[PDB]
From Swiss-Prot, chain A:
Effect of W234T: Complete loss of polymerase activity. 87% loss of RNase H activity
Protein's recorded name: p51 RT
Disulfide bonds: none
Mutagenesis or variant effect for W370L: No effect on RT p66/p51 heterodimerization
Consequence the record notes for mutating L177I: 29% loss of DNA-directed DNA polymerase activity. 46% loss of RNA-directed DNA polymerase activity
Range covered out of full length: 604 to 1027 of 1447
Effect of L247S: 21% loss of polymerase activity. 16% loss of RNase H activity
Listed result of changing D175E: Strongly decreased RNA-directed and DNA-directed DNA polymerase activities. No effect on RNase H activity
Record annotation: effect of changing I157T: 34% increase of DNA-directed DNA polymerase activity. 18% increase of RNA-directed DNA polymerase activity
Outcome (variant: V179M): 27% increase of DNA-directed DNA polymerase activity. 10% loss of RNA-directed DNA polymerase activity
Amino acid sequence: IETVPVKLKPGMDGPKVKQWPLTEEKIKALVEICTEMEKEGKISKIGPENPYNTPVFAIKKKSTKWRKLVDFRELNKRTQDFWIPHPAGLKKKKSVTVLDVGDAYFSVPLDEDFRKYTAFTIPSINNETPGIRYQYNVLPQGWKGSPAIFQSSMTKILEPFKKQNPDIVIYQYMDDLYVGSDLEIGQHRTKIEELRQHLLRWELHPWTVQPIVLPEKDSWTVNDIQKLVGKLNWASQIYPGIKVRQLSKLLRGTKALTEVIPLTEEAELELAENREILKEPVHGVYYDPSKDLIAEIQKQGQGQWTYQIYQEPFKNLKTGKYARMRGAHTNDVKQLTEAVQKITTESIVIWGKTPKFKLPIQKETWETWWTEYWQATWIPEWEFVNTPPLVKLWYQ
Amino acid sequence: MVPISPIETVPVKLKPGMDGPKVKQWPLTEEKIKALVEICTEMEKEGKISKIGPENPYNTPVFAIWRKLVDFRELNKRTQDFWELGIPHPAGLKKKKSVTVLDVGDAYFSVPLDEDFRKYTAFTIPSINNETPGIRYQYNVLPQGWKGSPAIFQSSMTKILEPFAAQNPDIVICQYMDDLYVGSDLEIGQHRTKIEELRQHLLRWGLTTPKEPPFLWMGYELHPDKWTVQPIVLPEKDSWTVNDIQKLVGKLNWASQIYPGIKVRQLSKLLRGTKALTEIPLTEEAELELAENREILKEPVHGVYYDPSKDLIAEIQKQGQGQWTYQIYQEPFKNLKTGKYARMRGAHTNDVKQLTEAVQKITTESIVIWGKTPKFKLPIQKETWETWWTEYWQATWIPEWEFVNTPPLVKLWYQLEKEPIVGAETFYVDGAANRETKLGKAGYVTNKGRQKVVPLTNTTNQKTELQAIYLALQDSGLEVNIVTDSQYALGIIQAQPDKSESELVNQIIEQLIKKEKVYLAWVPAHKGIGGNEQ
Ligand SMILES: N#Cc1ccc2c(Oc3ccc(F)cc3OCCn3ccc(=O)[nH]c3=O)cc(F)cc2c1
């Protein structure tokens, strides 16, 4: 019931970010929600002496009820660094469930001197009236300081459960609580329900770096060997002993692409050695908590997407392939949004922080539509690659 | 006296490390001095300012043009930052049976200033011949030209208008600076009654109120049933300068929101990199543009107001040379507004990408104006968009739309095969160039024995790699497989441009269009892959 003092970083003024336009239904929903929050003392209207602003929009989570989401990215990077080792056993557990404990922050009041930095604006249509300005009087969801402050309280709330079931790992990131166990799916499901009721009083299955595979054919054409040499040449940047001279010697001459070329013994030996090399993991691949994580995403088509998480080029920490088929066949942007969310979730589970995405989409398209399919409470950083990658089929 | 309702002040602080401005006073003529003395005497009698003692060390200059002109320049450089941008667009306004304009008078002086900040607004009137101490004053209300006055007045006006608006949902009030615009569908007598109730409710807080259609507002003409822009004056000068071209472009851009078909590409190209106010002839294409635009601006064009019960529609047309035009309407032949989109600065592009960018722009503009995304009518077949987005390496999306058959239609001019072609000749191409002498070669070899190598001068490695592919397209049949080692050339062709700024790329595209099936494969260079005859 006593606020903890919070300050910003030296030489950095509060956040002043442009509020982007919203549709009429989202504006209505934000008006109603913010009115209810105002009647509960969670937020309060402010005057023009507050120059700071943080973007806010409306989302529908996994259900029909609207939800208020605030893009606290600029505030988080401007909020002072606040002073827990990442539970490396969380990614080694059989099953992990994600819970939303955002309703617990709204009990702890926020520092009086810091509230002016949490200001946000509900925009109006056609600029006919000035926006509705609010500031947070309690701990705000999405702000990185909210879990850092509530850490002590949450530690107390979960102390009995942890002693009761010491095999269950509990991690916290933003407004989300990750609960892992190696129990049977049904056993862990009921146990998660037990943790839920314990919280009321006061589906993930962790995934490797997928290997590089080469086709196995009885007869190879010129085109097959050309693609093979190109894929092995690309893989030679990642693996030391990849050689393609005996396979390139088969392509000697000017033959039609559909013509079948029989493989020689040197070529099958070289190909076999390349296979054995690829079956081994990558040499000297470590994680650096002082470096950012980079996530690249490629569109393969037919709802299939590939992704690679790394820090240094050709040193992948994680690879995967997202191919969910739930109500997104027609919209590529929706699939990309859900794919970005899943990759971010896995990154939060493994390393405890979000990566920086390189999205295969024009900036204008993404900026226009990404909020329409966003269900997460956090927001990662992203950039846009407008040059087509050639390694597209080399990860497929 | 009936006491007017109290208006709570807004606390103001100066920027950190700064304090109240202490600027000396400039010499003024005796006429200016007497006028400022009389003005400040009347203002002090009205309670807007107050005589101050010498303890206050902060002062700000003041001139006279009578009208007093106090300069708060350094105080604005010392005052903190405030909130508050864009103006309401007439196409988003909703048709009302009655619309009243009320201009608040003595508006800033009606709102009090923060008492702990009045000491920093002090000014000195220079006495005659400077034989006496200058008269000293401080502002007790919002000064004219101050940084914080518009925001504080806006916030106060909102807090005052809120209860009357909540009590009268049958009227809609728009608030813009020193003006209020009240619209209602009630009867004229009930409307005027609620206007009198409004100005009485404003008079309770001490706000004085008094125009009629057509309204000349922010370069617009607002009529009861229509809206348009104020007459645009396009200057006629045989000799033009860069400042002139920029002003002409801005006027044309303004008129383009209602006048369809406005093109500014040729004139915009003239001001490329000048950055100099004084400098420009008109190319034959440009003279047409200004003459086309002069023809477009010759006839009257009016827009209508927005009806929420009707669907919102936007139709797009391709103008050529990277130019696009759109009309936003609800009923046929009655536009809410119009607009245009110019392609971004790039070396390669195609129609579908530009059409997508235009859709994104119209979508954002629509969400700003009407708060909703409109249905689109696009000159592109459903099959074309289908093939495009399914084979595009980038994720792309267009909201709900339908195909309108108004040529020119956006189409896909060529499509690369996904697999090699049986029975098609295989052209292994390659090109190289010397870095010092700028000499190079480009050629091909095929499986049937067809060969060609062409000597080239004043060329680059990339130009030769493209030239080799161009040669392979020229001498091949309707179906052809092509092998290259140029990641550059493959990267260009896989972007699928229908036009380029490079003549060689354009010729390659023209060759691609004439083909039936084309398979473009890639192999690593200098790996000893046969056929790659570097
Ligand atoms: N000077 C000036 C001026 C006058 C009215 C304005 C206005 O007016 C309106 C104010 C409130 C409202 F609900 C609806 C309005 O206009 C709806 C459309 N419209 C417009 C004019 C008319 O004569 N009849 C009509 O239907 C809205 C607005 F942004 C700016 C305005 C600026």
